[PDB]
Design a protein around this ligand. Structure first.
Ligand code: FAD
Length: 295
């Protein structure tokens, strides 16, 4: 029932770019683009939580072909237009430091993708991943802990859950559980999909809670910048009480190193009731209720 590896690196799907919109608004940090691809002419199917590979053009410094980089799928199975013909990605341009040869180094595949023109052909492989899939249980609770581009799989769940055209397209899935997104970003102009996330919270105030950790605008109780781990510690008792429900699934996605602060908050909360979190978390992973994708 889960599509996997319908296309592989030795014979990828050649899709075309339809659009390439900026997501970071004026005053924000960096470049993050929303890129939609045409899937007509092939049989690429996918579902929510999965990833696809992109093969960038060119050769590395040794003269070898550039390999694929994985990107979380940012659209539901139906695409943004709910027509089953497209797929979207949420790509941040990677750039960095002086202690790495030269001055500023630009990532090959993320620079390629964030500056790609409509009409351009792209090499696509996949889909891949069964670690971040959404339960078909409409009464599930869904905790979502994201930073930056880790918002991508979360957007596929929330759109499936709360978009009107999705609800009309998926008769089998009419969500009525509770979902909570904690989204960590550096500025308010960096809140990817801010307008659409906040519209969902207005229509479904009993089914969706939205919490931000904005580091250049908020301080934690110790005086430092507000990060997602500071927000998780703030609500650690509530998050633990929801995690004890048999229906609750937790998703964590973003850049590596966010998992350590989430566990230390949830550890202190579990300890109060005589539970060892790291032991409890193993059972959750085997049960398929603890989903992690960091990179
Ligand atoms: C499952 C999965 C899902 C992903 N989803 C997304 C997504 O939705 N959106 C998204 O933008 N990205 C996503 N990523 C990351 C993405 O695959 C690529 O790694 C990223 O876009 C950078 O690729 P590049 O080709 O731009 O960089 P490369 O050109 O390969 O540059 C990366 C290399 O340079 C180095 N480097 C990187 N950062 C630094 C730093 N601060 N200091 C020093 N050296 C550094 C390392 O050697 C790293 O291997 C995902 C990764 C995985 C594994």
């Amino acid at each position: 029932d889960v599509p996997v590896n319908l296309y592989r690196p030795n014979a990828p799907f050649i899709g075309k770019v339809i659009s390439n919109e900026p997501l970071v608004k004026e005053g924000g940090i960096g470049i993050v683009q929303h890129i939609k691809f045409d899937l007509t002419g092939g049989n690429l199917k996918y579902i929510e939580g999965q990833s696809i590979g992109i093969i960038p053009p060119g050769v590395d410094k040794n003269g070898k072909p550039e390999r694929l980089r994985l990107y979380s799928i940012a659209s539901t199975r139906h695409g943004d237009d709910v027509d089953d013909k497209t797929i979207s990605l949420c790509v941040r341009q990677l750039e960095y430091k002086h202690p790495e040869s030269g001055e500023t180094v630009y990532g090959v595949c993320s620079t390629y993708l964030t500056h790609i023109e409509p009409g351009s052909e792209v090499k696509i492989t996949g889909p891949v991943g069964k670690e971040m899939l959404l339960p078909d249980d409409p009464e599930a609770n869904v905790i979502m802990l994201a930073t930056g581009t880790g918002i991508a799989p979360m957007r596929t769940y929330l759109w499936r859950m709360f978009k009107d055209a999705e609800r009309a397209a998926n008769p089998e899935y009419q969500f009525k559980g509770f979902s909570w997104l904690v989204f960590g970003v550096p500025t308010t102009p960096n809140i990817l999909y801010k307008e659409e996330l906040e519209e969902i919270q207005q229509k479904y105030p009993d089914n969706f809670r939205l919490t931000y950790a904005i580091s250049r605008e908020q301080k934690n109780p110790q005086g430092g910048r507000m990060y997602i781990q500071d927000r998780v510690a703030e609500h650690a008792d509530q998050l633990w009480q929801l995690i004890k429900n048999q229906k609750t699934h937790t998703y964590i996605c973003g850049l590596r190193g966010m998992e350590e602060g989430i566990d230390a908050a949830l550890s202190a909360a579990a300890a109060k009731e005589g539970v060892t979190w790291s032991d409890y978390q193993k059972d959750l992973k085997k049960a398929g209720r603890w989903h992690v994708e960091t990179y």
